[PDB]
Amino acid sequence: TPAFNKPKVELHVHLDGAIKPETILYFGKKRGIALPADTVEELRNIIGMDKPLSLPGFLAKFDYYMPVIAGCREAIKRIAYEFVEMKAKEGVVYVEVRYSPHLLANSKVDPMPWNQTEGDVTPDDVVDLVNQGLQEGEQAFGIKVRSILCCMRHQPSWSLEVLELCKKYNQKTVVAMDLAGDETIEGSSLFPGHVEAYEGAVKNGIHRTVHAGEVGSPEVVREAVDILKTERVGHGYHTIEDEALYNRLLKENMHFEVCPWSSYLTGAWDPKTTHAVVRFKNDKANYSLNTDDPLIFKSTLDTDYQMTKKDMGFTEEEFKRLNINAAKSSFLPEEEKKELLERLYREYQ
């Protein structure tokens, strides 16, 4: 019995972090590229985490399988189509999937990812492949699916290029720009390449979202807010350590993309302490419950909801409110956003 068997909205989930173990296996075999395990079950266990690690610790999991997906046109599109299917089955009526286009490419990328051998798959090409898959997934399963292109904290040179992709494919799936990666890199939020990209997004009406306060101090959330101009904040658990910033963001209707299970596994959340989302709930903050990387976390959307239900005390009421809030704070145009709110309100009666 799921915790909330009613329509949901997810804004914070990773394409490259939500691939099926079966599909990873398929391509490892088909391409003759190696994997840390030979069966889907053994692969699940080695790519997945059972206990809290660290942000850098969690990031090492992509090395296991990315090499097998990156560079193959049929793989990139396939995981996009299968993603939608996975969400539809979760009750998700609207989702925004994030991914770094450069990390799946094998041509026109200076630091060649995963030691790939030169190919013809351009970062731009991966954006077009993902669009097709998500769009076929929408038609095929009946849920609205949009994408978000991720700037990598350790590679600011890719940033202005991400900005262009968001411009080029504006609303043709791409709805916003993100900043993901290793938040422990002191001052990465402020690298000129990242800064320039967000400043440009503001001048061009491209929506912005930034990971901050996941593992970093509230000072990083302030960089995201003041310099980067985020509309939303990925994670943001640490914002509450700076009361003034918290209540300021609270009073500004800042949307927090919360991922309960994720925060536990990465170490972002000290389990010995009451989760930030409980304060968020009690303060009637504008937030959402997201999965982040179901693959690496061995989870589904019901994992976060149950967690917040059994522990933390979330009610059906708070789930509806929380989802309506995600709908309002989505990066969709007004017309489409209304359509969404109609769906939720219709199916919430």
Ligand SMILES: OC[C@H]1O[C@@H](n2cnc3c2N=CNC[C@H]3O)C[C@@H]1O
């Ligand atoms: O999708 C682009 C990149 O983002 C990383 N990424 C995936 N999940 C997370 C990441 N980034 C930072 N914080 C924790 C968690 O939300 C890996 C991936 O290659």
Ligand SMILES: [Zn+2]
């Ligand atoms: Zn994330």
